[PDB]
Scaffold this active site. Structure first.
Site, PDB file in Angstrom:
ATOM      1  CE  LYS A  51       3.673 -25.078  14.973  1.00 13.54           C
ATOM      2  NZ  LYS A  51       3.432 -26.538  15.144  1.00 13.54           N
ATOM      3  CG  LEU A  53      -3.593 -24.161  23.156  1.00 11.41           C
ATOM      4  CD1 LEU A  53      -3.763 -22.743  23.703  1.00 11.41           C
ATOM      5  CD2 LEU A  53      -4.627 -25.083  23.803  1.00 11.41           C
ATOM      6  CB  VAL A  56      -2.111 -21.920  17.765  1.00 14.12           C
ATOM      7  CG1 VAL A  56      -1.085 -20.784  17.797  1.00 14.12           C
ATOM      8  CG2 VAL A  56      -3.211 -21.623  18.789  1.00 14.12           C
ATOM      9  CE  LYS A  63       1.227 -11.112  12.389  1.00 17.75           C
ATOM     10  NZ  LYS A  63       1.419  -9.719  11.894  1.00 17.75           N
TER      11      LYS A  63
END
Length: 71
Positions: A51, A53, A56, A63
């Site tokens: 997340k 990055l 994201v 997932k």
């Protein structure tokens, strides 16, 4: 070749699913996250780190967690 390539492929599948339901915006978002994950120079151990990055989202991180749970 990239350490996250496997996850990137799974993201592409998710993008296609979003397209299948008419959610083009979400599909593009998944593709953006996939590119960033490829550019990242290390294998990611969890989606929560993913997340961080750009591109994201929380759903994408989940997932990633699931894929790790599968192996």
């Amino acid at each position: 070749e990239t350490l996250n390539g496997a996850l990137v492929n799974m993201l592409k599948e998710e993008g296609n699913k979003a397209l299948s339901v008419g959610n083009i915006d979400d599909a593009l978002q998944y593709y953006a996250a996939a590119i960033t994950l490829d550019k990242y120079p290390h294998k990611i151990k969890s989606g929560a780190e993913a997340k961080k990055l750009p591109g994201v989202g929380t759903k994408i991180a989940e997932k990633i967690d699931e894929f790790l749970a599968t192996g």
